[PDB]
Symmetry: D2
Subunit: 116 residues, 4 copies
């Protein structure tokens, strides 16, 4: 059973803490990224359908030092060793002033998370 609760570090050095996942898959936590360190809240859910041991999930980071938003989505795996590892991908939405600048406002990438 891979669980989202606990403290995680990613391939980029950023860290996150997720609280308890409730009966409806809902969960909250904080995302911690850099020197001088900033915290931002995050909210999401974990898919509970078929009570999968490696469930999908998604979660929104409400950046508190910029006007941006990032969503992450992925799955909670247990690798060959028995270790919990979060494979995710994200869309970073930047704020743009004009709707004509919309096409360039969304970055994409990966983040792998292990337990800290």
């Amino acid at each position: 059973k891979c669980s989202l609760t606990g403290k995680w570090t990613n391939d980029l050095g950023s860290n996150m803490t997720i609280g308890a996942v409730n009966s409806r898959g809902e969960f909250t936590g904080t995302y911690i990224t850099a020197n001088e360190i900033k915290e931002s809240p995050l909210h999401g859910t974990q898919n509970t359908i078929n009570k999968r041991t490696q469930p999908t999930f998604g979660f929104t980071v409400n950046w508190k030092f910029s006007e941006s938003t990032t969503v992450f989505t992925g799955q909670c795996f247990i690798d060959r060793n028995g270790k919990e590892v979060l494979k995710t991908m994200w869309l970073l939405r930047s704020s743009v002033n004009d709707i004509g600048d919309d096409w360039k406002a969304t970055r994409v990438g990966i983040n792998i998370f292990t337990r800290l």
Copy 2:
């Protein structure tokens, strides 16, 4: 100022209904898709920094008919007419059984929403 509360419709015919956005930008709603109609819940946050009139935003749909999870993120624009438009991009995470299948698990696309 572009607000997320209300009922929204997108380019694919899917419809969604967002509740009130509290002072920390948090919000809940339901997402409605077909092909016939299933409803799943969604959670997310609207970015509040600088109180922008076209904020960015992002939200997770906890699909209740499948093991999948989708995140959207984008911005709440005002078009040339004065209408409210949501420009979003999404990641659809599918469930895979083995971590070695993770590479093929994430679909990407766009959605544009107007009000109902």
Copy 3:
């Protein structure tokens, strides 16, 4: 039979010209984007497997006014009317100076193309 040859305009006002697709799916052309107008070469291929009437395809734009690169990929459709329409998505790779800036160097979006 949807064909990639010809001149196309997209939802963002940009225009492209594609030459003949040869027996190995290979094709070249020029991408034209804005006021003051710039041209950049593009090279790609069209999937020929099963000689599908609506084939997939991909193509790289070698930007000549920046250090960036954009790839597009999609499918050549014939909609209900009988009209050729190119549904595509793209990754815009920006140049970054340091490998530690890699995570933020890739934008994603959509472009729909019709005949000009």
Copy 4:
């Protein structure tokens, strides 16, 4: 200066071989994947503007065992050791029959290449 010519291997075990990059940055190669081994051709261009020692780049794989097309794009870095690394993101376009299925046709992911 990071060059693309040679044989490359990525995080998934896939291997590729790129030929010479001519003065306009154009190049050809073959892409090798398994699960057993199929080879498909690839075409693309390396961005030449400002003759950067870590250029961006992008290339289309014309898969010859399926109706699909994948594009990659990224940058040719030099890591702290002095090694050459290709940091890429990709879009995998699947063939769909009806335009109404287009929304679910595009997968996204990452690949990191080192030399053979």
